[PDB]
Each structure stands twice: as C-alpha cells, then as structure tokens.
A paper describes a structure:
In some pathogenic microbes, the response to oxidative stress is controlled by a [name]/zinc-containing macrodomain (Zn-Macro) pair responsible for establishment and removal of the modification, respectively. Strikingly, however, the “catalytic loop” found in all other MacroD-type enzymes (also termed “loop 1”) is replaced with and extended loop containing the zinc-coordinating Cx(4)HxC motif, here termed the Zn-loop. To gain a closer understanding of the functional role of the 3α-bundle and coordinated Zn2+ ion, we solved structures from the three sub-branches of Zn-Macros namely from S. aureus (SauMacro), Methanobrevibacter oralis (MorMacro), and macrodomain-fused [name] protein ([name]) from [name] f.sp. cubense race 1 (Foc1Mfs1) in their apo form as well as of S. pyogenes (SpyMacro) and MorMacro bound to ADP-ribose (ADPr).
In the Foc1Mfs1 structure, the Zn2+ ion is absent from the macrodomain, while the structural Zn2+ ion coordinated within the small subdomain of the [name] domain is still present. This absence leads to increased flexibility and distortion of the Zn-loop within the crystal structure as indicated by the loss of density information for the region (residues Asn133 to Ile147). The Zn-loop appears to be partially stabilized by contacts with the 3α-bundle. In particular, the contacts made by Asn46 seem to contribute to the overall stability of the Zn-loop and the exchange of this residue to cysteine (Cys61 in Foc1Mfs1) within the [name] branch may contribute for the absence of the Zn2+ ion from the Foc1Mfs1 macrodomain structure. We therefore created macrodomain only construct (Foc1MOD; aa 1–305) and compared its zinc-binding ability to SauMacro. In line with our structural observation, the amount of zinc copurified with the WT Foc1MOD protein was reduced by approx. 75% relative to SauMacro. Surprisingly, neither MorMacro, which arises from a minimal operon containing only the Zn-Macro/[name] pair, nor Zn-Macros derived from Msf1 fusion proteins could demodify SpyGcvH-L. In contrast, all Zn-Macros could demodify Glu-/Asp-ADP-ribosylated PARP1 E988Q. Identifying the physiological substrates for example, for the [name] fusion protein would not only elucidate their substrate specificity in terms of attachment residue and sequential context but also reveal how these proteins contribute to the oxidative stress response of pathogenic fungi.
Author numbering: 8 to 30, 37 to 132, 148 to 201, 205 to 243, 249 to 302, 308 to 342, 361 to 597
The structure:
C-alpha cells in the first residue's frame, strides 16, 4: 500500500475526472514522489472545488476526515478545560457557568461541545465535506431560509467540536432597535439550542461564540449582556462554559473591558506539541536549525530582505551606507528576543551536545549568549562585510566596529551618512563593499569555514556516539531547501531511529514527510514560533 494521503488524493483526482467539474492527469502517477505539503494543498483544493453533487462514498469520507484531523493536530491546540474565566455566573448551589475570553483560531479549541459559524471558510475547510452535505439537507428539509437571529445545528464531523451553530446576524449600511434585538436573538437562539444538546462524557457543556458591518463595541456589549442575563435567568442550565472567541486585538480589548481581568489559574498539553515534548525530554543531543522565521517571530520582519540586497535606487553611496549602517545597528541592538532567551538557557543543559546551525544569521544567537564554538552560519551573517567584486579570499572585515564608528555621523531623518570617509571600500582593490551574506555569485564563504568545520566535527561525533539526537527546525522557508530542510530529512532517514525532527513554523511548509511521521521519527508544530517555544521547553 501507498499511504492514506496518496490513496485518498488519487481517488479525489479520479473523482474530478469521471464526474467532476471543470475548474490534469500527470499528478496521479508522480504523486508518490511529490512533497507531502503539496499533496495536502492539492487534496484541500479538490474538496474546495467539489461539486456537492454525487456523494463521495463512505470509506473515502472516512479517509478525508482522518487526514484533516491528523493535520489539524499539528496546530497548537487549546483544551476548553485549560482556559481561565473572566466571569462566573453562580447558579445558587446548583453549579455555575464560566465565561471566558479567548483570542485564537476557533477550530483549534478542544473538548468543546459546540462552536459558532456566521452564514464559513475555516469551519468548512476543517469540518470536511460532510458538513456541506448536512447543511444542504437540513436547509432543504426546513424549506425556509435563515432569518436574522436564527440558528441551524449540524454535527462537527472532522472538527474537534461535537456540533456547529450556524447563525445569521443583522446586516446594516446606524444600528436600529430591531437590529440590536436581532443580534441578541442570535445569542439566545444559540444557548437555547445548546441546552437541548447532549453533554460531553464528563458532564460539561461548552460553546465558542465568534463575533457575528456592525459597530464592534456595541456588538460586543450586546453579546456579553445578552449571554450574561440569559445565564442569570436560567439557574438550572446544563451549560458549563461560554467562550467569547475573538480574532483581532481590538475585539479582544472591547471584550476584555466588558468582562474584566482573567482569574488566577487554579500541564496536560495536546497535539503534536505533546509528542514533541516527549522527544525533547528523552534527547541526549539537540541540533537547532533556524531560518528567518525565528527572528521574524521576535518582531524582525514575499521578500529576501529586498531593502538591503535587492533595492538598487540609492541617491548616493552615502545614502546606501547610511541605510545599511542603520539596519545593522538596529538588528544588532534588537531588544525583544524572548524566544531566544527561553531557547538558549534550555540548550545550555546539553553542554557540548547542543549545536546551532542558522541560514539567516542576523547575529541574534550570539547576542543572546550562544557560543560561537557551537554555532554555524553557512549563508553568511551580518557580522562581516566583503568586497563586491570578491577580488580575494581575505577581502572581508568585521562589521560591528564600522557600524559603531559610523552611527554618530548618520542623519537619522534621511539615513544619510554625513561623513564620506566612513564608506567602506575594499582595502585592496578599492571597490564597493556589501554585507557578507549569500545574495549573489560574489558571495565569499571563507569567513564561515571555521563554522562549517565545527558543524562537521559535531555531527560526526554525535552520530557515531549513537546518541538520541533531536533536530528542532525553527522557521526555515522553502527558498533554499537544500541548506537545512532536506539534510534534516536526510539525517532522519539514514539514522535508524536515532535522529528525530521537530519542524516548527507558521503556514503549511511546517509539515514533515508523511512517511517519517508514520514511523514516529518526525512531527511538526504549525503556529507562531514565539508561542510554540515556551510550550515545547517549559
Ligand atoms: K466532531
Ligand atoms: Zn576587492
């Protein structure tokens, strides 16, 4: 057998033929040698352009549902029972309903009886095709359309939630009293429906409400006041938790004002994160491979730092270096580095059995205290300048002293260097200089050769001492996958289970090879590196 992903994908391509739409052939055969992430994107495309027309058969829907679920478990997951309330509605001595505020992706809440949907995109992608077919049937069978304030209940299918509440709010162009009342009816309709649904097996019952072009401050207070009174007036309610789920920071603020501070917490992690944590705690050695995504998580951010290496319309060399010196300075003094400040002390517990190899050397490893003897930078770094004609191997120089000596002489409004004697020129051919990073055929890799030698010696020793090596790959994109990503996959493949890979990043390039995940050798954590790292390493 091929994998479940390969099997399922070929039947959906096949379905797109025999009775498909027209929105070709080759992918079906070469599939087995295509990249996992690419194939999941194709599978999701096949489903998005599915004519709902002939029902997919049961066994195929089961496979689709398994895949969506397995992929969604790579996200950082939040169980309902981990949240902390901002308000408690006390039901005499009968019990209580907790009211929470939570910013995030509603499909990544776990242990949640019901979630809400307006009228679409994320919930349908994640629930799978069964949701479209149940909404279609239930809408036909009721015959009428949804009025503002009404709700349609479906199963959650491939979602972690048991049920979905699909509701229509009012629409405006200035909110009238009828529209205020329509929005409140939505919340009431949701809670009344939810009262009648079964509980989870532990007796809890929970709903995540999304924000339902209505003024956000007023919508938010109708939501909180409506839910609050309804719970006050239903002391016998079987409802135990209501989550106001915001996405934007402004909504979270509107809601936080109305609701108040979060209560005091009174581990049990989940998803690929728990597995990654196991691996990290059993490791005898750790390699960190990092790309630009790690520093982007700290606030330093399609482009290949176009400003420095691409942009080529400088009014003069004084402007060019004024900008370059200001940039090197700002990076060198970056004050917000909490992810580095958590990762580095954790790596130090490994002594000589930890190593850092980075393709986007902005210098933040060294500046948060990682030693250069356990560091590699094969695409170069901001630590050096070089001759732009690359006239000889020695035509490089440390950048830091030149940055420092130049900064007092740069007009901050125009970023113009006001002393031309500070323009760096090749001390041998006198040509222009650049930052010594791979950004063109002129790159000189000679100042990083010692780093390369340290990496070869370290790998060699760690692999031969048969150690349980974990590769934590942080924020590596897809521009040059041969530098870190493919060699990491390779070590995993060659090393007979002694090497495992945890890839962490945002977006779908965070995925690892399906077959290595199946063997328990590789997993990934898709989300913000700044969020994942404290969770992996606590
Ligand atoms: K479900
Ligand atoms: Zn030169």
């Amino acid at each position: 057998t091929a994998s479940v992903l390969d099997t399922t994908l070929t039947r959906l391509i096949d379905d797109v033929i025999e009775n498909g739409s027209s929105f070709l052939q080759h992918y079906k055969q070469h599939l087995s040698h295509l990249e996992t992430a690419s194939k999941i994107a194709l599978l999701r495309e096949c489903l998005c352009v599915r004519p709902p027309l002939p029902l997919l058969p049961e066994d195929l829907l089961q496979n689709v549902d398994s895949i969506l679920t397995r992929v969604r478990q790579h996200k950082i997951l939040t169980p309902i029972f981990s949240l902390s309330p901002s308000r408690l509605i006390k039901h005499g001595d009968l019990g209580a309903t907790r009211i929470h505020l939570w910013r995030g992706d509603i499909t990544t809440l776990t242990g949640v009886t019901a979630i809400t949907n307006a009228a679409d995109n994320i919930i349908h992608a994640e629930a799978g095709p069964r949701l479209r077919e149940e909404c279609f049937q239930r809408m036909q069978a009721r015959g009428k359309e949804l009025e503002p304030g009404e709700v349609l209940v479906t199963e959650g299918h491939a979602l972690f939630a048991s049920s979905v509440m699909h509701t229509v709010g009012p629409q405006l162009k200035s909110p009238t009293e009828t529209e205020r009342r329509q929005l409140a009816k939505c919340y009431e309709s949701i809670l009344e429906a939810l009262e009648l649904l079964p509980s989870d097996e532990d007796g809890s019952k929970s709903i995540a409400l999304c924000c339902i072009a209505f003024p956000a401050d007023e919508a938010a207070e109708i939501a909180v006041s409506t839910v609050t009174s309804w719970l006050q007036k239903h002391p016998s309610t079987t409802i135990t938790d209501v989550i106001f789920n915001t996405f934007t920071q402004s909504d979270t603020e509107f809601y936080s004002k109305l609701l108040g501070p979060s209560h005091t917490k009174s581990n049990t992690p989940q998803g690929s994160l728990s597995l990654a944590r196991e691996w990290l705690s059993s490791a005898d050695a750790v390699l960190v491979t990092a790309g630009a995504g790690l520093s982007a998580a700290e606030g330093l951010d399609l482009t290949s730092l176009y400003s420095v290496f691409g942009f080529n319309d400088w009014p003069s060399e004084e402007h060019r270096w004024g900008y370059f010196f200001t940039h090197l300075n700002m990076v060198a003094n970056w004050s917000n580095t909490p992810t580095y400040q958590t990762l580095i002390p954790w790596l130090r517990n490994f002594g000589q059995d930890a190593f850092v190899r980075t393709s986007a050397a902005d210098g933040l490893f060294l500046a948060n205290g990682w030693p250069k003897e356990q560091l590699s930078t094969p695409q170069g770094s901001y630590g050096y300048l070089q001759c732009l004609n690359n006239c000889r191997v020695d035509a490089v120089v440390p950048s830091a002293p030149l940055v420092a000596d130049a900064m007092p002489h740069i007009d901050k409004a125009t970023q113009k260097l006001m002393d031309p004697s500070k323009i760096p020129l090749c001390r041998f051919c006198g040509s222009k200089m650049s930052i010594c990073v791979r950004a063109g055929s002129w790159f000189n890799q000679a100042p990083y050769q010692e780093g390369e030698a340290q990496w070869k010696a370290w790998k060699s020793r760690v692999l031969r001492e048969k150690k349980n090596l974990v590769i934590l790959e942080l924020g590596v994109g897809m521009n040059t996958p041969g530098v870190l990503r493919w060699p990491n996959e390779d070590l995993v493949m060659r090393s007979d289970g002694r090497v495992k890979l945890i890839r962490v990043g945002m977006g779908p390039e965070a995925m690892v090879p399906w077959e290595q995940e199946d063997e328990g050798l590789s997993t990934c954590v898709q989300g913000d590196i700044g969020r994942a790292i404290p969770l992996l390493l606590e």
